[PDB]
Amino acid sequence: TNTKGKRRGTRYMFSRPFRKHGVVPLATYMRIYKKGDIVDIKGMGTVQKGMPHKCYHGKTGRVYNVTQHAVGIVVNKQVKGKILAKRINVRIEHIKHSKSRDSFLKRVKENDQKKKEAKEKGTWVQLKRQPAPPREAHFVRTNGKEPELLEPIPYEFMA
Amino acid sequence: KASGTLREYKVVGRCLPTPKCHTPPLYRMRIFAPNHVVAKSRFWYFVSQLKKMKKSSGEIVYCGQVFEKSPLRVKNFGIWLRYDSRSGTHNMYREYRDLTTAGAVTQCYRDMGARHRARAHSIQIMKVEEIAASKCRRPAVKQFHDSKIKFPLPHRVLRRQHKPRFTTKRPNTFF
Amino acid sequence: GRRPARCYRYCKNKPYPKSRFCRGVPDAKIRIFDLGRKKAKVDEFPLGGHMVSDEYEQLSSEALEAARICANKYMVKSCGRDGFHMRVRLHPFHVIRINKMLSCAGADRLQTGMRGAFGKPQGTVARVHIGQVIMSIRTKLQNEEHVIEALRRAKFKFPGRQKIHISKKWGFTKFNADEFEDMVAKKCLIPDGCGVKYVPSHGPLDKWRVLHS
Amino acid sequence: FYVPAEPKLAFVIRIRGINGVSPKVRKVLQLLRLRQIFNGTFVKLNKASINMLRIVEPYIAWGYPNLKSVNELIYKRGYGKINKKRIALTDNALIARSLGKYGIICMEDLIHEIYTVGKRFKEANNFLWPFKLSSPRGGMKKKTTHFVEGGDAGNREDQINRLIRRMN
RNA sequence: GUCUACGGCCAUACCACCCUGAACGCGCCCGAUCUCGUCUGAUCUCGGAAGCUAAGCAGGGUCGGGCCUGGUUAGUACUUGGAUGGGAGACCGCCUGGGAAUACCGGGUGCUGUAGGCUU
RNA sequence: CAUAGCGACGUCGCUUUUUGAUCCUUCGAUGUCGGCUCUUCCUAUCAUUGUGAAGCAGAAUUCACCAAGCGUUGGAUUGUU
RNA sequence: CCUCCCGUGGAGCAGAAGGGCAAAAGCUCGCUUGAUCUUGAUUUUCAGUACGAAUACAGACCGUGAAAGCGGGGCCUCACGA
RNA sequence: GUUUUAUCCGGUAAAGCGAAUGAUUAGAGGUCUUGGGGCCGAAACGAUCUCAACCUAUUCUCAAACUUUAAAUGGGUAAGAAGCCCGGCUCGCUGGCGUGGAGCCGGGCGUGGAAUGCGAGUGCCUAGUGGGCCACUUUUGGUAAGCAGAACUGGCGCUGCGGGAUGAACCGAACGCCGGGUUAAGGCGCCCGAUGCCGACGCUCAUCAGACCCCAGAAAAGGUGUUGGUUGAUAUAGACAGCAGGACGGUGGCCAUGGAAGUCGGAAUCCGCUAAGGAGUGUGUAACAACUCACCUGCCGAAUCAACUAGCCCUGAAAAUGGAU
Ligand SMILES: [Mg+2]
Ligand SMILES: [Mg+2]
Ligand SMILES: [Mg+2]
Ligand SMILES: [Mg+2]
Ligand SMILES: [Mg+2]
Ligand SMILES: [Mg+2]
Ligand SMILES: [Mg+2]
Ligand SMILES: [Mg+2]
Ligand SMILES: [Mg+2]
Ligand SMILES: [Mg+2]
Ligand SMILES: [Mg+2]
Ligand SMILES: [Mg+2]
Ligand SMILES: [Mg+2]
Ligand SMILES: [Mg+2]
Ligand SMILES: [Mg+2]
Ligand SMILES: [Mg+2]
Ligand SMILES: [Mg+2]
Ligand SMILES: [Mg+2]
Ligand SMILES: [Mg+2]
Ligand SMILES: [Mg+2]
Ligand SMILES: [Mg+2]
Ligand SMILES: [Mg+2]
Ligand SMILES: [Mg+2]
Ligand SMILES: [Mg+2]
Ligand SMILES: [Mg+2]
Ligand SMILES: [Mg+2]
């Protein structure tokens, strides 16, 4: 009995944040999107043209085509029991660069730097980041102070 | 929390050192638990109730059993506790006689279960204290403060009712 | 023609306020929420006693009206008509609905059974939580037993379990009674009518020097 | 106060059966190689493994094995996964042929690598077939509740060794 | 130490009132032949340089409002998973992890990019 | 004179002798109203036995308790219940 | 009717509601016909079929503006047919 | 069908309304007006008194179709050899630029760049099904339903076995034919395997006791039944309980009147005597009167009283064949 409208259920999704209405800041238009880079589809409602569908709000994809005002994004969509890589045309107002890719390329560059430097100076170094290891043994000093004795408080009705 | 014969554990914990306080304060509690694992769990429960600590953001630096320093001496234990009934929370003060502190706390748990149907997870023991005989308030305890205490064992019920199961003589209850 | 209150006791539905979608709501039974000497100053009535629910449930407007009337009558009998101030702390904002059926010997007569079952507004009830205050009475400190008895008599007009509580606050305010006198003394509180105005130590100095003058 | 190093080796025993299991718990139990009740597996402890153990907490009983528990487990129920088969560790050549490239060539090397979690703990642990232990002699307390509330599930710190003694 | 032109983030920048402003500058200011618009050279456009920092503007101030950021509220409300837990129920407690928001009390009040000036 | 006898505003229940709500059983069929006849069962007791209370002086009446042993009828009208 | 001041939009944008918008998307003027001619791709419903609606392009011919640009109907979500 | 480390997405739970949009309680302070008006203001309400409206600062209570703030759970992406870094070539695209972008061609880099687990990829043909139902949790309508409709996971259907006496779905556990050992859930008077332990501590007597998830029967409200607990009060300057006295004068206090004299009703709580006494807690007298109480005193010589609270038990507790832990 639900309608099939393109913007059904997007009352808060496409609405602007509190006290963030008005002119779209221009640095969003000044971003450079190459083919193959990773973008996050958000979809502000100020610009009604080139809007993504509500099923792509919050999804992340890879740019494959660049036009004057929009980009082509390959984004995975799950439909029933299959995931298919949809291709969507979204104006640049509704996307932004994904920081996870930036962090990963920074890590790759730093790892290559470490490899080159370590090969120059011979000493092996660890690159594969490890999960949080168990805490090692250590001494906890008292500094001549008795640890405070804690007792549960008696019950009383407050309000 | 189930039960058994409880033991007293001195559990000491603290927050993890963070670059806001490099030496967080150490805190100490007396936990009466069947074993040290339950003692650690109850310590975290209580210090989460009191301070803003969690098992994840803190550590336990000591968890050792507190041996009774006079298990050969009879003494009076006063216990302050709170528990949740079926329709509210109540603070109670109860008195018991035992050689050991943890024995008196176990007595308290059994007695709360017997009289108030209070399961052990509802009961919060907030102070256990040895009290002098002149500071006792419960008549059930004060009647044992007699240097010339004297009573018989009036009606001794046979307990060996199955050895023998059949016999000619009817048992005697006066001894 | 009202249904027994057991049929609308529990908070089973979402809140259903009288709004632009819910029209045709009959007016609530309770219209007056403050009785006694409402014009009494703050220092006149230091003692304040609440009656607190212990169950998450719905209290009907008629039940609030009946309890308010009973407490008013007992307070007038005991402390006099001007020795107290009562405040009903619940407002019937939730509308209950009735799917009315024909109470005759026939189902063929367009009864339709459960078809189109969404009802019409029966009345209004008040949703009360565990620990929420239902009624509050403030009076002289020497009428504590009379307040307790008046609130005890009002409990019999309500479905669930309620508790009587003598608050630590001064009157109907939110400040503790022990701190109230020495807060008024150093002008952190300014009385006005039945309440007090907390005066924080920030703002223009002109509003500070109109005080201490 | 001396706070000891946090344990880095855990023995995880699945205590509940395979009926009516939620998909996430089922997937994590498959990732722990615990596909049968009373199956045991050594788990190297870190944040990821601890969170995985948190996911399947009602279905497992785990703790910190001591040296004796590791010795008894490897010597009595130690089976190797050689050519995708379950082979009893009756000879040192069986260990040497499958793990000699990691320096593990005998029962003692395997036990040392498992106990002190070494560089090649993953290979030595995956080489071991998950331990198919018996029912706990003397019974359990309550498999449906946590250890700290009178039951058997969850993390009993070092009382897993008592369960191991009664288990194999 | 600042200003102008163009900006980025878009209140830590806004709002009300008060004080000060050296040199450039920005302005107010003078005028309507031309360009161009008017009911009106008020706005717009154009041509200027007598006067003034009164205003805009800049900086500072207010037990200032707002905003931003902390603490408290509070391991509270809420919540993942668990039990042959309690209770007639409504609901509640515990185990396992996560964890807020007012009121209330502190601190702060634009940062900066390019180009070009002034400041002994 | 609140409570001998009643009980507004509220509020908590019980029953399945009303009518509904639902559609689980029955559509290769469970004969569908009332009356007659006949037996047994329930008590939320009309009378009768033993009682307590009253605004029980007697008489009559009302409320309540133990209590279903026993009884609860003849007719006009109506297919009637 | 005229004038000044305050005025974050509390008005208006054809309509139901929601979103959006201030030297705007609203009001008033000036010029116009991009509501035109075409091929594909894509989104929405979806079986990833169709219709409908829509987004981003590309090729013509134009409109407007000093220009950057904007426009192939209506600020967006409906207004339709093998 | 997993976690971890990064990185985005959201508007539910909560919370808020001295923040917007709606709903809403009460006082307080101000001073304009077609507010009523207000007693002596007409005369310039000479005056200033009340209530309105309004404003300001507060205050009670709310929202599925409200919201500043805002979780838990959750959704997407990334965690390398298809990568990184060097040189060069092509373009009719772009263009101040040897510019940007894309493609292409050589070359060098392996610590294989989180944990855990698992062998994967791909094609053809294809039956049956397309009435479902149930349980935890969330949730809509309904008084409710073994009612109707959704979300999530599991189950029954398709499934036997141990337990719940009995039972499609509950709890344990899923199944080839067997022997030994051990358990789960559940149990161990007898039926009926196992407590024929010299089990531990208490609670409870019911002339309808109670007795184990689902589940197969109960509520509000009471109890001087008993057991704990909380708070408060009295007491050798003698409590408590019993038994015995005084319980006054003005004043048969005022306004009520037909008597109301303390007690059919309205207001206030005087004084002195002291051992105390209310110009009254009740009975009542047509009315007096006579009583009793709260208050003190005498005897009596050690502890006592009150209000709550919650455990078991009792009342509340009534249906039809004779009957069901
Ligand atoms: Mg009825
Ligand atoms: Mg509903
Ligand atoms: Mg199961
Ligand atoms: Mg045995
Ligand atoms: Mg279960
Ligand atoms: Mg300020
Ligand atoms: Mg929690
Ligand atoms: Mg059906
Ligand atoms: Mg037949
Ligand atoms: Mg027949
Ligand atoms: Mg009877
Ligand atoms: Mg074109
Ligand atoms: Mg358009
Ligand atoms: Mg809410
Ligand atoms: Mg509001
Ligand atoms: Mg169907
Ligand atoms: Mg259903
Ligand atoms: Mg079938
Ligand atoms: Mg199956
Ligand atoms: Mg089965
Ligand atoms: Mg069976
Ligand atoms: Mg049964
Ligand atoms: Mg066997
Ligand atoms: Mg049996
Ligand atoms: Mg036997
Ligand atoms: Mg009963």
Short mmCIF file of C-alpha atoms (C1' of nucleotides) in Angstrom, two decimals, chain B residues 85-87 90-91 93-94 114-117 138 159-160 162-163 165, chain H residues 196-203 227-231 309-312:
data_model
loop_
_atom_site.label_atom_id
_atom_site.label_comp_id
_atom_site.label_asym_id
_atom_site.label_seq_id
_atom_site.Cartn_x
_atom_site.Cartn_y
_atom_site.Cartn_z
CA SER B 85 11.66 -6.54 46.88
CA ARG B 86 8.78 -7.25 44.51
CA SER B 87 7.56 -3.66 44.95
CA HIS B 90 14.71 -1.32 51.15
CA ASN B 91 17.72 -0.73 53.37
CA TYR B 93 20.41 -3.92 59.06
CA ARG B 94 20.82 -7.55 60.12
CA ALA B 114 14.36 -17.62 53.54
CA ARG B 115 12.49 -14.64 54.99
CA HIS B 116 12.13 -12.15 52.12
CA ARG B 117 12.47 -14.46 49.07
CA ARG B 138 18.43 -8.07 67.57
CA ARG B 159 17.99 -39.16 61.79
CA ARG B 160 19.10 -42.75 61.11
CA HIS B 162 16.79 -46.15 57.37
CA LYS B 163 19.61 -47.94 59.25
CA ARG B 165 14.70 -49.49 57.91
"C1'" G H 196 17.77 -45.56 52.10
"C1'" C H 197 22.83 -37.82 52.36
"C1'" C H 198 22.45 -39.32 60.39
"C1'" G H 199 22.48 -32.72 53.88
"C1'" A H 200 22.67 -26.81 55.77
"C1'" C H 201 19.79 -22.30 57.27
"C1'" G H 202 15.11 -20.32 57.89
"C1'" C H 203 9.47 -19.48 56.52
"C1'" U H 227 8.35 -13.61 60.76
"C1'" G H 228 11.93 -9.96 59.41
"C1'" G H 229 12.83 -4.51 58.40
"C1'" U H 230 12.27 1.20 58.50
"C1'" U H 231 11.07 5.64 61.03
"C1'" U H 309 6.98 -1.71 54.96
"C1'" A H 310 7.11 -7.11 52.71
"C1'" G H 311 7.70 -12.55 53.17
"C1'" C H 312 4.50 -17.10 53.97
#
